[PDB]
């Protein structure tokens, strides 16, 4: 199939690393500009966590699309198009912890 | 009517039980209850007598009522009842 930006996973992994460097070097500015009440480590760990969620992906086309969406998210953060509400949406705080144990799920509700 | 808790009952029979927290919404406020139970109001209407074997009721007013329906009056034990209006008709016996 026709590629999007890369023809090999190695080429696709290169763009992921480039995005990570841009994201990693942006977190100190994001905390400073948005006046976040978190630490630089928390944001950088959060960036790592979101990258690690899409770690099982093997199709280079999907990898390119994820980086394309990754750059779009970074542009909003750099340009302060996002707000403190948008930035802190990754750090789910109002959401109560949902246990993943069967017995805990059994006690709560009919959730399969 | 009035429920045992002291709460007026609606025409649908709904009335919050004493063991129901939802009754607290009526604490400093009122419970909106219509005082014109339709089931009581229609039964008050008399049963019209028509010599014909089949009559038609439109609810009164023509186009301001309901679709016209025709009612059989053969059963002497009961009275033909309009589906929409609820009015009763009886063939003289």
């Amino acid at each position: 199939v026709k590629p999007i930006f890369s023809r090999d996973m190695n080429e696709a992994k290169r763009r992921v690393r480039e995005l990570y460097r841009a994201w990693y070097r942006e977190v100190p500015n994001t905390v400073h500009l948005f006046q976040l009440d978190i630490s630089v480590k928390q944001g950088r760990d959060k960036v790592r966590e979101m990258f690690m969620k899409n770690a099982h992906v093997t199709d280079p086309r999907v990898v390119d699309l994820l980086v394309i969406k990754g750059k779009m998210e970074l542009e909003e953060t750099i340009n302060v198009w996002k707000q403190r509400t948008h930035i802190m949406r990754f750090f789910h705080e109002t959401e109560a912890p949902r246990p993943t144990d069967f017995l805990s799920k059994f006690y709560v509700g009919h959730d399969p | 009517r009035t429920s045992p808790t002291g709460e007026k009952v609606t025409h649908t029979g709904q009335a919050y039980d004493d063991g129901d927290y939802r009754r607290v919404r009526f604490s400093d406020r009122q419970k909106e209850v219509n005082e014109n139970f339709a089931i009581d109001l229609i039964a008050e209407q008399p049963v019209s007598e028509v010599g014909s074997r089949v009559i038609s009721c439109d609810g009164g007013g023509g186009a301001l009522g309901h679709p016209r329906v025709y009612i059989n009056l053969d059963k002497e034990t009961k009275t033909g009842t309009c589906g929409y209006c609820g009015l009763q008709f009886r063939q003289p016996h």
Binding site: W81 | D58, G62, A63, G65, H66, P67, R68
Partner: protein
Amino acid sequence: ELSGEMVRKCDPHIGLLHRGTEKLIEYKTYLQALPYFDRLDYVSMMCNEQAYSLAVEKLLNIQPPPRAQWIRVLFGEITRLLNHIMAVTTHALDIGAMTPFFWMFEEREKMFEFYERVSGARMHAAYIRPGGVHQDLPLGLLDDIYEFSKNFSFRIDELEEMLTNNRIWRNRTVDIGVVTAEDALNYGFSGVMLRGSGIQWDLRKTQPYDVYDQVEFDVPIGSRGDCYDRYLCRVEEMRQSLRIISQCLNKMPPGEIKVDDAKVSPPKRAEMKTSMESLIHHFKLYTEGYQVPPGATYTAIEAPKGEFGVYLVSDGSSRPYRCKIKAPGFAHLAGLDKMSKGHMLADVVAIIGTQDIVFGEVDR
């Protein structure tokens, strides 16, 4: 991006009014999707109904009755007066001229009860439906419309007295937001945004719909492409609407206001309560609705803000599969940066107003 007050870059961020109309339409029947178009351009409501009605009728392969078409045009131009009053006065209000806003909005109030007396709603009448209109004109409505349109010319002339020859208004609009004819076509501009640059194109003349081929009116054409010329076009379009309204008030034909096809348009309540066939169809049309034959169409009309088009896709059921809405202001706002090059901050305020943008249609 401002260098002092010079606009280096103009980046429009939209979607703050994106309500997902096009997705919500897919879950509702063709009749239920009609009120959605009233809210797209909430300054010109009945025009949006007409565009949707024409698209459905084109797919339905039916024809509205002759009287309904004249009512669609009479209220189509009354709708145009509503929009151009809003378009011009609020444009002047943002410039700084606050007085003409109140003068014309009293006339805008008189036209609002024309909506209310014929439908029961001041703005969202949901009156123009596929197959004609909903109800016939109440007795004495045509006379009152004549009385309003008789004196409305003076209101426009009073508006021109305050703006047309005012040197301050000309300084704020002349040579502001100049759009070349070639750029306007490529950027997708339509309506006044085209005819303000000299392009001779009106969808009521070239591609007439309803009875727009039986009315006589003049298409105002600009010469410089600036805000001032488009201001003159909209003012003249209001005058030309009165020319059309007078013809509609004298050429109104007798007849029914719905296509006499009870499988598309609901039967009369008198027929519904007496006829078995009428009750069945009334029952089905208001629960499932009419099935539209499979196919797709792009029907566009000359809305007050430009070309308003609807790309309707039908899968054969009673609910539209896809309903893409072409907002005339969607393309106009896309060229805001192109038009606001080398202009100050105060000029962008003028340029936004002259494009006649309502974000309901932009953010469908």
